[PDB]
């Protein structure tokens, strides 16, 4: 998925917020591995994406 | 005479006295009461104390 930088932190165990709430929550004993990398070059339009 | 017997209970007694005090005790926890942790923290912050 997408987020904003201020949101990367949100992803995590034991995490609150409005994406943690109302987007996409972890299991406390979540077990895996979180990638965040910075698509600006490709997700931003000039105009507005 | 009795104090033997007398001794025993009290010792009984007092230990169940101590074991409901403890209930009273922080810890290191913010409070001593379950719902009052519950009602002020949400679980990701309330689980921790």
């Not at chain 2, 009984?12 to 923290?41: E, P, Y």
């Given at each position: ?12 165990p034991?995490?609150?917020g ?5 987007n996409?929550?972890?299991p406390?004993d979540?077990?895996?591995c979180?990638?965040?990398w910075?698509?600006?070059?490709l997700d931003?339009?000039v105009?507005?994406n | ?8 209970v ?5 230990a169940?006295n101590?074991?409901?005090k ?7 926890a ?20």
């Amino acid at each position: 998925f997408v987020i904003r930088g201020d949101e990367v932190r949100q992803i995590a165990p034991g995490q609150t917020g409005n994406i943690a709430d109302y987007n996409y929550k972890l299991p406390d004993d979540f077990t895996g591995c979180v990638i965040a990398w910075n698509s600006n070059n490709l997700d931003s339009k000039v105009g507005g994406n | 005479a009795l104090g033997k017997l007398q001794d025993v209970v009290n010792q009984n007694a007092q230990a169940l006295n101590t074991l409901v005090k403890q209930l009273s005790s922080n810890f290191g926890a913010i409070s001593s009461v379950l719902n009052d942790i519950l009602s002020r923290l949400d679980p990701p912050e309330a689980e921790v104390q």
